[PDB]
């Protein structure tokens, strides 16, 4: 029907796991939610009266310096939380660092907090909670006395993900300062914009870093960016490499590893209001200017805990491995403010599975008994191409939960992941969320809570009353079958509060369209039995005369016929009503790809169009099939479809800064392939 | 608690203009201003913000916003000349001045910006001036280095912002009163003391209720302005009726028209006004 | 249509370059402007509020001795900068030499500043920034103590372009004196006029110089010119040739190389007001008297930096090669006050590509890894004729940006240049500017910023609100298609301030015609989508009954039919309404040219007229086709059409001084060819 292909799948029930438990929890393990029926009644309560649901969890899991008086500010027209004046846990005080480190370090001092593995396989080490406390405290004093940082100021971090970066972020929070984290691979122009927009005065960096065996000159990029910035007074530099030929200017270059020794190993937390900003994330869609999405402390922290507890069903005895950069929202939520806050160990991996040979993730998982593995789908596709030969010698038995985020997962990939890594026993949690939500919006819950469909997030996370709206106007869609856009009826605790120094952009972007609801920006469909499918961003919908076209559905069709490794569907200007469908297809093996073109590539194209035509339909079937070696990908884990769209359209020059991509250089080929 | 209850009822100099502000709406406006003061004007706890505004809703909001961030406010009657303004600004050591461009009282134009600019010529202190463009298109100089447009800056801030804890004995405000001798006296009143006084008075002298409308016929720069326009009825929970003009304009029946139109229940007026109304004669009632 | 032929071209997008980066920047290279959309918004800001755009760049890139108070003096009727009272960075102080040398020499002392290659291939050397500092300082003391030069005085320079000339100009600036540079090849009459008009008292020269293997007697020319000049008190002579038989008179001939050793190797900069004159250029159109165009210090320097940063997208690690003489405005802007100020190395070449064999430029480019190549179009035409056989053994891989200036470039040439030198990868920047603008007015920007049309400058440079005006009167042309003259609505930082000792001429020439706008003097057309085409000087428009005739368009047509090497179109007096069209055409090969004339030259003429007639039209088609061996060319890089016009008209005697040309002697043939 309208997505009949996409949604016509079998429901997979979750099987109990007991035989993958480690001795640590084997004697007491029990899921936090017993079944779907508890989800259903608890969810109901969360929506109907947040005052009690969040009200209680807020004090049971967070350690407050001062109790709060009000759970939330209500909407005058209804008892639900207001979007425009969203605020929670009013008048209480809470220090995020206290809850993340001291709370545990002072009780369970000899428990691993951080497990670190470097780019080169022979290096790594662990840090216990006691040790973390001491490091955080010394850094906080450095910031306080030498860098001159005061409550409410801003500290920019441009570090690679290393233990020192984690420590730094915690130390900043400890003194009531706001942190802002910029992906280490960004160029100096975008760095400069972020530094200036957020008004930082202190920049924390490294001299050089290594990722995938390649050297990244982090100091030089910072020095460049700061040439046009009047703000910054001090730069703190961590000499990860002890002897590089990197300039160092004593007037404002402080050696992280030399300054630290001058400070005491215990230093107190500064009280912070529950609504004070915790951090900013300068996200970007390469339009306008980077948006300093702002999240407050109590809100964000509660969100992160509830998610760890109910989505991933974690325990204090686990190891949570998040395969992603610290500058991304998942870095914050699941590397630093997730497991540490909860009390689980975090596995930190600075490199890429590419180096030295694709078996790296697996080797990591077994060596450290990783129990949770949360990975971007792009990584999964690359691993899948590498082939099953890279997992022949791994049992991966310790894993108890798999999941992914950042882009729709085709059922084809989901099935591979389930069969080869999860061994048909471990549930795969496909979670849907946005930087601005700060936490999961729609997701399967682990344990035995919900049946799963391959390829579909399932039900709204507690407290979020998601609805599919008529895409054009007015009313929602109250029906057994709905196609529209996803939106939320009321605010929740970790909803981004604003955009740094631009509240108008915030309102116009998210709350003014379809007023009354939070506009997600993504398309969606509500299935029979309530599963919510994500159809792709609204902005990328290709309009064909016959019907709206879901990029998620067509891409899912194209990946069948296992000659295809990857694919992106792009609308393209044509003489047709609306737009033509074009597709960028990556073939699995180069040898098949490089052959006499008339001889065989022509049939590959016939097969690809044939499949879409029969399973999705004639309007969808692509006309332009471009067979390429790869697709542009972002650091954040997504195919950068906007680039493909511009190149395909013909405006291949104005792509903005290529250094948003994880594979810059690729554009050279993309342009040639499109032209011919 | 009671978000859709009138907090401020405002009537302008010209009879056809006015509007109401509810408590919910007031919260949002106060919060945005407090952030403006915090981030753009650089105001910090214990600093001093001078206000030279006419009595308009924005002036009320401003005073509340200043208090919200633990700063001390000082209010100068809008009609004062630049010499006395200068003395008050300097004596109180303000660094931030909040004003308007032009205002109208009794049909006459008061050039508030020019007076401030004059006074500040001899003052080394002030770093920023916030200007509310009550009149949208006057020919008033505006210097970007330190003139901030109240109505443009505000939109950049969120609609909820927290209160800063203040000690019960910290100064709430200063009033530079004068008997035209010596120098203006910055009479200082502390927070817990003053607020309790104001509440007890509302409760026992005027016997008010949450359902009333309290109309005080007097300027914000006077002690009764503070006690009965801003920190009185609002604190108690009654609506405040704010009238920027004079009974003189257009014709002496103005106070009466106001009282019946808005069902005023309490009327507190200076005796001088009463004498003038009395002369006008009973034909006006 | 009206220029339909000229403007009917395909847009060429710019391709990313990564594969031409050198290791020096390979790890951190990123363009200064990310795309057209940033150009567009930034340009908007530059026009709407210069106070912030220039205000900030002015302090971020120039090192001020005293900060300025006001960015500019406004026009009473509008917030834009005044033309009549143009002044910038009021009340600040800035020493140009400090910014050009000391600023870098004191930080990066062992970095090449100047790379010098002589006329003879076996000679050349490099000068580092440290070394430059020492040489400049000694010269400044010489000027101060022996030559008696004081702040505000004038020093004339008549040197060949050699390292010593560069040093001299910097040294003059260092002591607050005004320099004036005269092309070394000028005769004594025009030298005398420039010396006297500018009131110099000190003349700096050489004894003999060699260009193209020929000897230029620079001392004798100066001695001649000074016979009628009561002013000059001292002449400083650099004995480039150590043993020539050149008179030297001790009373006022100082040996540059003997005097210098008496001075210390460090000497301070004198504070100079931001509006003090930096230099004069005695330009000439061979009418009236040479115009001492005057440019002030802060204005000019900022212009030069912004251009280097945004048009050429340079980095500190580049080598910028400008193929042109120091006495021309591009000499100043791109040999001395450009790269040095920025921090790039300058490649200085004293000779001509003609010697020894046309491969010289290429040999230079590869030997020194030149990354930027900026050349006059006349040079390109000569190289093109020489033929592709002279580039068979060069990769020219290091080049990342090509460009040209001084005359319209036919698409035919543009394409050749792009294909054979730029290898279809490097962008070609066709930049339009004037001595009086001091910087680019209309130009493509490098990097990926703009699509390019062959043959058309693109968009106005930041801060310049260019408009096409009705050529006859009043109002501008607000339309999708406009033909008129180019003008600018408001002043910018490096607009010439005046004409030395003749402000009235300045006003009458540039601001009084079409009052309210700066009158460029060149014709222009605004295309669809905003590209600005330059149609040639207004003064040379040939008026035919049918329509105004653009010399640029017709010349572009004539160069097609690749038998034609070069061409100039000249209006000529006839019995026709207005004037006839005449053309001087140079054929590529002499052997084809020298043959039985009735037999073949007659068909060449038929073909040439045929093409113009069909592509441009019947009114344009030439009547007089004169086939010649060459065209007169200037030192400044232009066909000296005025000569051709006079000879053709019949007044072949009154040509003024032939020694303005790079090929004097040519007139002998031009006269014979025209007559017959
Ligand atoms: C830094 C940055 O750009 O991050 P962010 O602002 O968070 O991106 C928001 C987008 O993430 C996508 N997304 C995430 N999870 C998904 C899922 N399960 N299925 C489909 N799309 C999914 C959507 O396309 C959202 O519109
Ligand atoms: C010393 C001297 O004579 O120099 P200058 O005073 O600078 O000459 C000004 C003239 O330069 C020409 N010019 C420069 N760049 C151009 C371009 N891209 N397209 C067409 N014409 C161009 C125009 O003809 C100008 O009118």
TrEMBL record, chain B:
<feature type="domain" description="AMP-dependent synthetase/ligase">
    <location>
        <begin position="1"/>
        <end position="285"/>
    </location>
</feature>
<comment type="similarity">
    <text>Belongs to the ATP-dependent AMP-binding enzyme family.</text>
</comment>
<protein>
    <recommendedName>
        <fullName>Acetyl-coenzyme A synthetase</fullName>
    </recommendedName>
</protein>
């Amino acid at each position: 029907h309208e997505y009949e292909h996409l949604t016509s799948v079998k429901i997979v029930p979750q099987r109990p796991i007991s035989d993958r438990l480690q001795p640590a929890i084997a004697t007491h393990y029990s899921p936090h939610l017993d079944g779907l029926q508890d989800y259903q009644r608890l969810h109901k309560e969360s929506i109907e009266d947040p005052a009690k649901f969040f009200g209680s969890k807020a004090t049971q899991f967070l350690n407050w310096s001062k109790p709060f008086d009000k759970v939330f500010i209500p909407d005058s027209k209804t008892g639900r939380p207001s979007f425009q004046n969203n605020a929670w846990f009013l008048n209480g005080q809470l220090n995020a660092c206290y809850n993340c480190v001291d709370r545990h370090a002072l009780k369970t001092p000899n428990k691993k907090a951080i497990i670190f593995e470097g780019d080169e396989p022979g290096q790594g080490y662990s840090i216990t909670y006691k040790e973390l406390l001491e490091e955080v405290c010394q850094v906080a004093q450095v910031l306080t006395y030498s860098m001159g940082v005061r409550k409410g100021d801003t500290v920019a971090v441009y570090m690679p993900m290393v233990p020192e970066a984690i420590i730094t972020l915690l130390a900043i929070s400890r003194i009531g300062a706001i942190h802002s984290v910029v992906f280490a691979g960004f160029s100096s122009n975008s760095l400069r914009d972020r530094i200036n927009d957020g008004d930082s005065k202190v920049v924390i960096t490294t001299d050089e870093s290594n990722r995938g065996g390649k050297v990244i000159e982090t100091k030089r990029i910072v020095d460049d960016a700061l040439r046009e910035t009047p703000g910054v007074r001090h730069v703190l530099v961590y000499r990860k490499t002890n002897n590089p030929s990197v300039a160092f200017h004593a007037p404002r270059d402080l050696d992280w590893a030399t300054e630290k020794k001058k400070y005491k190993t215990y230093y107190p937390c500064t009280p912070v209001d529950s609504e004070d900003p915790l951090f900013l994330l300068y996200t970007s869609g390469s339009t306008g200017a980077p948006k300093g999405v702002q999240h407050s402390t109590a809100g964000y922290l509660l969100g992160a805990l509830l998610t760890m507890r109910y989505t991933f069903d974690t325990h204090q005895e686990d190891v949570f491995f998040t395969a992603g950069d610290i500058g991304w929202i998942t870095g914050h939520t699941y590397v630093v403010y997730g497991p540490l806050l909860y009390g689980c160990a975090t596995l930190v991996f600075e490199g890429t599975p590419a180096y030295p040979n694709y078996s790296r993730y697996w080797d990591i998982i077994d060596e450290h008994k990783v129990t949770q593995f949360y990975v971007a789908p792009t990584a999964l596709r690359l691993l899948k191409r590498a082939g099953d030969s890279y997992i022949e010698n791994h049992s991966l038995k310790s894993l108890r939960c798999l999941g992914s985020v950042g882009e729709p997962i085709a059922a084809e990939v989901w099935e591979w992941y389930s069969e080869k890594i999860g061994k048909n026993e471990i549930p795969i949690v496909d979670t849907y969320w946005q930087t601005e939500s700060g936490s999961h919006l729609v997701t399967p819950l682990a344990g035995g809570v919900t049946p799963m469909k391959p390829g579909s997030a399932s039900f709204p996370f507690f407290g979020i009353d998601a609805v599919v709206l008529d895409p054009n106007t007015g009313e929602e869609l109250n029906t057994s079958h709905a196609e529209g856009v996803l939106a939320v009826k009321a605010a929740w605790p970790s909803f981004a509060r604003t955009i740094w120094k631009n509240h108008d952009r915030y309102l116009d972007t998210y709350l003014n369209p379809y007023p009354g609801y939070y506009f997600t920006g993504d398309g969606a469909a509500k299935d029979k039995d309530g599963y919510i499918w994500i159809l792709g961003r609204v902005d990328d919908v290709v309009n064909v005369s016959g019907h709206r076209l879901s990029t998620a559905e067509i891409e899912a069709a194209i990946i069948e016929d296992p000659i295809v490794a990857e694919c992106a569907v792009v609308g393209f200007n044509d003489d047709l009503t609306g737009q033509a469908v074009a597709a960028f297809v990556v073939l699995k093996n180069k040898s098949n790809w490089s052959t006499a073109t008339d001889d065989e590539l022509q049939d590959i194209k016939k097969h690809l169009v044939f499949t879409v035509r029969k399973d999705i339909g004639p309007f969808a079937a692509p006309k332009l099939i471009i067979l390429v070696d790869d697709l542009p990908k972002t650091r954040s884990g997504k195919i950068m479809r906007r680039i493909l769209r511009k190149i395909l359209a013909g405006e291949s020059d104005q792509l903005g800064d290529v250094s948003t991509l994880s594979n810059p250089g690729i554009v050279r080929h993309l342009i040639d392939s499109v032209k011919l």
